[PDB]
Amino acid sequence: MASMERFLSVYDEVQAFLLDQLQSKYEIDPNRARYLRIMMDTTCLGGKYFRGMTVVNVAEGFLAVTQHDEATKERILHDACVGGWMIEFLQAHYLVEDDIMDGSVMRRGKPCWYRFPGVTTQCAINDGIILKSWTQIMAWHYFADRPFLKDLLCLFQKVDYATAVGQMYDVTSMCDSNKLDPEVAQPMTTDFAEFTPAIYKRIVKYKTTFYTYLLPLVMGLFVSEAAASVEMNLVERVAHLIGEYFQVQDDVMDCFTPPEQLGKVGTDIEDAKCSWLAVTFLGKANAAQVAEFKANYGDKDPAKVAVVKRLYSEANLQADFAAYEAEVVREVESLIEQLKVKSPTFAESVAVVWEKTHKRK
Template sequence: MSDLKSKFLEVYSVLKSELLNDPAFEFTDDSRQRVERMLDYNVPGGKLNRGLSVVDSYKLLKQGKELTAEETFLACSLGWCIEWLQAYFLVLDDIMDKSHTRRGQPCWFRLPKVGMIAVNDGILLRNHISRILKNHFKGTPYYVDLVDLFNEVEFQTAHGQMIDLITTLVGEKDLSKYSLSLHRRIVQYKTAYYSFYLPVACALLMSGENLDNHVDVKNVLVEMGTYFQVQDDYLDCFGDPEVIGKVNMRMPKLQYCQCKYPNL
């Protein structure tokens, strides 16, 4: 394991401990254990590319200068906020898609004694982000911009998810609305903003930059995110579940691909 990833996981443990002892809520032993299990199952199990990108981007913006321990911790904390956001989206997305597996294991809502409690778990995951930002960034000059950034990206992602869901209703075979231009719109809002733009935007804010001065950066990152999601959709349709770690039950996407690209 790389030194950066090892340090990153250490920060996860710190943030998790803070959340499990948050004075705003009086935990019982059972509730604390359940939240800890939920976090460990859903937050750190992926590739962590989004979170690590915050640290890597901030290092590049520092132009080779060694990060202080505080800077490393703050960059890792912002990275984990994005991983928490990712977990929040995935927990709810799996319910909406009626998926069976995620990252090579059963979706959280499919576990015994979880079920639709997973909806509230998703809400908890989103609220944890606000707690982390408040605990560690409230005294920074860019705190308000951070909160606004996460709110805006969540707004964009939720609307991208909405377009996806109302266009590819399960059981409907009319794919006339599902065009390449609409697919691009879906993936831009559903994936590109939070997966590619958000990590770099966090690093820019940490560096004292005004995001309004970096529209070109946003545009390039959104294009990268769109390309990434096109690849991911292809794997959803034609990838081996044993290799990609999930079974996608969204048949309209597969039907569309087979209709538009019959030679694939």
């Protein structure tokens, strides 16, 4: 698509601004310039650009209904594109650090950054930190004199923190809360009592929905000067509900989509994740199924994973997924109708964002 090439053109411009800055102001040499350009490319590119492109789509909606000079249109789209790359590079930061943390081997068809032979955990941790700095550099440089600067930086901060908090929920999810203790090595849960829908929705709301839905949609608004025309409590509710659905699809795929299509080898049973499949499982299983789950879940052992998969498969979790899906379709359409009151244009951009999610892979 032509729009995605134009989006990528803003990325080249941004990469070129960033590296030229490191050469003229940070005394960087060409080899380290090169190593950071490849790190940037490897960690930021290759995905679908769903988050980044959403910013552009929202602003586009507003430009179709709104009087501007051509130059203002170009300005508005170029800001939406910059803003989008801010979110793509934030994501890039969290995925680098997440793959170190989740013990992961592959992503987007390639080895995780830290697993490249010339990188190692050592560099990649700092590379990830650089990725997020570059998001603030981009903001301060391209939005220097935009009336939305401060609001944009405050919202980005808040989204970044929520994400880090979510990550903390996610990584502490196989542990019993009463056992969390920096002094004592964390033993895996044996009861699985915190594997509940309420806990799962919590984990998911923070680790995924702020940065993948709330941030793109609001940034589209921010860069459009369009925030005072939508109901923000509604933007929050629809973002949190679509992104929760998006995570649930993530979780299903980790288990049941072949690595070839997923392009990232699935580690949820091994890692003992609080996934949608394990929670939904424990919500319908009889006593002996539960006991078999407990003897097997959470271990690298290739045969103990089969047992889990077959439990999941025989429990019929596609029935639960269709009830779940059908109920999300109801609330998402309902929120879309409510956004129509104040903002018909934004409602339609949410409808598009919903449509693309609901159809993914």
